[PDB]
Structure 1
Amino acid sequence: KLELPSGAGLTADSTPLMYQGLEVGQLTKLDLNPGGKVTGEMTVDPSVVTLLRENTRIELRNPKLSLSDANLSALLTGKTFELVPGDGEPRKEFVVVPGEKALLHEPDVLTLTLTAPESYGIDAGQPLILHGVQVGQVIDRKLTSKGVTFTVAIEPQHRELVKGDSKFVVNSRVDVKVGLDGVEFLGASASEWINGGIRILPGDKGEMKASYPLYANLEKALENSLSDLPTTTVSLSAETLPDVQAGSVVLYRKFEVGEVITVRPRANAFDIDLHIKPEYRNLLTSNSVFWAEGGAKVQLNGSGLTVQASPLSRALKGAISFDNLSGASASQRKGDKRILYASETAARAVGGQITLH
């Protein structure tokens, strides 16, 4: 006896049970029980009755379009029951599921509910890719009020390899960043783009938690930034600086680590929010002063005219530097927070304050 999903392409005496490509059984009855429950039953070969066991699954195969092998026999038959055996106690009734849901009902499977703020163009049947090779499959996609929650499955052979710590990257969208020295193509290959799906960045050791986030691209998984707006580490004030609206780099001893994420104008002085990396927050303390500069500063000193070997951020939107020093505590004792100075020498002006008349 079978519990069919829907008797769509199934025939009362003409749908076979394939096993190793050979016809084993025959769907001999097809009913519509009340409640919208299509059930049928099947006569199998007595040689194969030993194979019908507890872990044995019967799933229907679609007449899928083969671009490599143009066969008319596959298109003429239609729907087809495929037998895959298992082990255990011999049973005599089965539950058939559709083609996309079939991976969930393997005897071993790894099912993960992974959340996302958007579908990102991921369909229900996209492949799931580790190291270029397909290791699993997305099963279904359900939209909630918070966002999109996917349900993915991992095949039993690859089950050992994810090891509970992993990152999940979308492969459904292309992304091109252009620059003079920075040229990169993120998110896909053209053959991978038409398949699409979710990429695993596998880790070393974990506990396999229930829910995972789905990162939008590759660098947001390495930054561990599921949200679009990063955490504001330090807040500044500045009267008039042409530096940046958002996206210049935080310099340290003229070196590019950090980012300016939020400014707001005010009638007197800006309010500026900075991002620095979590491995990197030890490099600044209470005794730290901030100063900003804007654009290509061509020095005239002697013969040299040195153009700023700059990130192209600074060429468009002027960067911000900082450094630690000795007596920067007294500048922070006054005022609510640090102040972003307009020049390097103005930020160095610390110490005892005299008055000339």
Structure 2
Amino acid sequence: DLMIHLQAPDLGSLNSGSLVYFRKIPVGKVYDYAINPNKQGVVIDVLIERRFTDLVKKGSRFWNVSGVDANVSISGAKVKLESLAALVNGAIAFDSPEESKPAEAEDTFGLYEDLAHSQRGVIIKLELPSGAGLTADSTPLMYQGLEVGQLTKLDLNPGGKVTGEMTVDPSVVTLLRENTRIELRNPKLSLSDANLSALLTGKTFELVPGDGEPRKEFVVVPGEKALLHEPDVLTLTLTAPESYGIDAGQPLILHGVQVGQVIDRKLTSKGVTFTVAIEPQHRELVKGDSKFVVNSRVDVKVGLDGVEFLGASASEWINGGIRILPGDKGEMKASYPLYANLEKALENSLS
């Protein structure tokens, strides 16, 4: 027989004589339990049967299957009663890996509290902005619309620094590399596709891959700020004497299509300084010379022969933002001015 030790933070629903499973086959039983010298944890020593000993490995993980847990899920709640024997007495299930040395001679093991906590994978440290919609064991990592990871830990370090960590699977671990971003998605209001599922899930970690050296720790930034930290991005600080009603997250439009986004708005004594960003595809297309025109205000001129509507359209007005007048050749200077309307941008009159 095999006499191995398990280290648990508490005994749980396990009694002496409760049963140990492999593939839901009883292959042993719990022999004894005792508090170790430190008050922190309970050591539970179990006894595998003589013929089953080979099953346990050095790289085995043991988990606890005891009691009935009921889950309420969106789009229907499937409550299934799998194992009746675990209710009365409790149980411990375990996995056997492919290639590992067989365990022997009172080898210790951590006892995970669930099958989901005993999933293999790689710990990935995150430096989160806030834990506003994040949950300790309930926030997933999406990639291509599929659940790849799970936020497994969320702490508030002193100094006001929210940090967490995440278990990601191996196939994605190969994907993880330098300049690979993890940004949090808000459950944004969708008008074209009416889905309750996105609203119910809440915050959602999105993975966008990159190339370079493999890294195992990332920094998460807010969705508005997320654009700034792209591998390729163009960051322009543009000045203006007034905000002109341009908020921090307005879209930024060239030739009718959104090519960039305003990132943030800072008020100074000289005026309002914006910091806008630009995507890689259109980085070539700006070409270092441009004019910047406000689309947040409407302008109507009435006349007997001259009738004109300037600087906005109703869809553009509700969207708002900054319009680009692209030029032919330039040096991509640091500061640009923000013109009040189009004709003052053609006149080059910022006053």
* C-alpha distance 298-136 of structure 1, shift in aligned 2 (>3 A): same
Q: What pairs up with 1:98-177 in 2 under 5 angstroms?
A: 98-99=112-113, 103=117, 106=120, 109-126=121-138, 127-144=140-157, 145-156=159-170, 158-159=171-172, 162-164=175-177, 166-170=180-184, 173-176=186-189
* C-alpha distance 48-254 of structure 1, shift in aligned 2 (>3 A): closer
Q: Distance in 1 between matches of 2:149 and 2:175?
A: 11
Q: Secondary structure at the match of 2:189?
A: strand
Residues 15 and 89 in structure 2, CA contact (< 8 A), matched pair in contact too: no
Match of 1:63 in 2: 67
Q: Secondary structure at the match of 1:297?
A: strand
Query: Number of residues paired by the alignment?
Result: 322
1:2 equivalenced with 2:9 (yes/no): no
- CA deviation map 1:106-163 (0-9, x unaligned): 4xx322112211123322222444334433333222222353211111234x356634
Query: How large is the Cα RMSD of the aligned pairs?
Result: 4.3
How far residue 295 of structure 1 moved from its aligned partner, in angstroms, is 0.5
* C-alpha distance 342-91 of structure 1, shift in aligned 2 (>3 A): same
* C-alpha distance 41-313 of structure 1, shift in aligned 2 (>3 A): same
How far residue 2 of structure 1 moved from its aligned partner, in angstroms, is 1.5
Q: Distance in 1 between matches of 2:310 and 2:336?
A: 30
Q: Distance in 1 between matches of 2:24 and 2:115?
A: 22
* C-alpha distance 213-313 of structure 1, shift in aligned 2 (>3 A): farther
- CA deviation map 1:157-181 (0-9, x unaligned): x35663436433446x522166xxx
How far residue 4 of structure 1 moved from its aligned partner, in angstroms, is 2.5
Tell me the TM-score normalized by structure 1.
Answer: 0.69
Residues 55 and 85 in structure 1, CA contact (< 8 A), matched pair in contact too: yes
How far residue 190 of structure 1 moved from its aligned partner, in angstroms, is 3.9
Q: Which of the residues 94, 108, 128 maps onto 1:83?
A: 94
Q: Distance in 1 between matches of 2:255 and 2:323?
A: 11
Q: Secondary structure at the match of 2:11?
A: coil
How far residue 82 of structure 1 moved from its aligned partner, in angstroms, is 0.6
Q: Secondary structure at the match of 2:69?
A: coil
Q: Secondary structure at the match of 1:50?
A: helix
Residues 246 and 321 in structure 2, CA contact (< 8 A), matched pair in contact too: no
Q: What pairs up with 1:235-246 in 2 under 5 angstroms?
A: 235-238=238-241, 243-246=244-247
* C-alpha distance 163-12 of structure 1, shift in aligned 2 (>3 A): same
Q: Distance in 2 between matches of 1:55 and 1:149?
A: 29
- CA deviation map 1:314-342 (0-9, x unaligned): 3586855545489x99xx9xxx9765555
Residues 265 and 271 in structure 1, CA contact (< 8 A), matched pair in contact too: yes
Q: Structure 2 counterpart of 1:41, which letter?
A: D
* C-alpha distance 308-194 of structure 1, shift in aligned 2 (>3 A): closer
1:210 equivalenced with 2:216 (yes/no): yes
Unaligned residue ranges in structure 2 (runs of 5+): 71-77
Q: Which of the residues 44, 47, 53 maps onto 1:43?
A: 47
Q: Secondary structure at the match of 2:62?
A: strand
* C-alpha distance 135-338 of structure 1, shift in aligned 2 (>3 A): closer
Q: Structure 2 counterpart of 1:79, which letter?
A: G
1:310 equivalenced with 2:313 (yes/no): yes
* C-alpha distance 343-163 of structure 1, shift in aligned 2 (>3 A): closer
Of the structure 1 ranges 71-80 and 204-213, higher mean CA displacement relative to structure 2 is found in 71-80
| Structure with greater strand percent | 2
Match of 1:94 in 2: 108
Match of 1:354 in 2: none
User: Percent sequence identity over matched residues?
Assistant: 15
How far residue 26 of structure 1 moved from its aligned partner, in angstroms, is 1.2
Unaligned residue ranges in structure 1 (runs of 5+): 351-357
- CA deviation map 1:8-59 (0-9, x unaligned): 322122x110112121111121112321132122222111011122122222
* C-alpha distance 63-146 of structure 1, shift in aligned 2 (>3 A): same
Q: Secondary structure at the match of 1:141?
A: strand
Residues 7 and 44 in structure 2, CA contact (< 8 A), matched pair in contact too: yes
Q: Distance in 2 between matches of 1:257 and 1:176?
A: 22
Larger-Rg structure:
1
* C-alpha distance 274-72 of structure 1, shift in aligned 2 (>3 A): closer
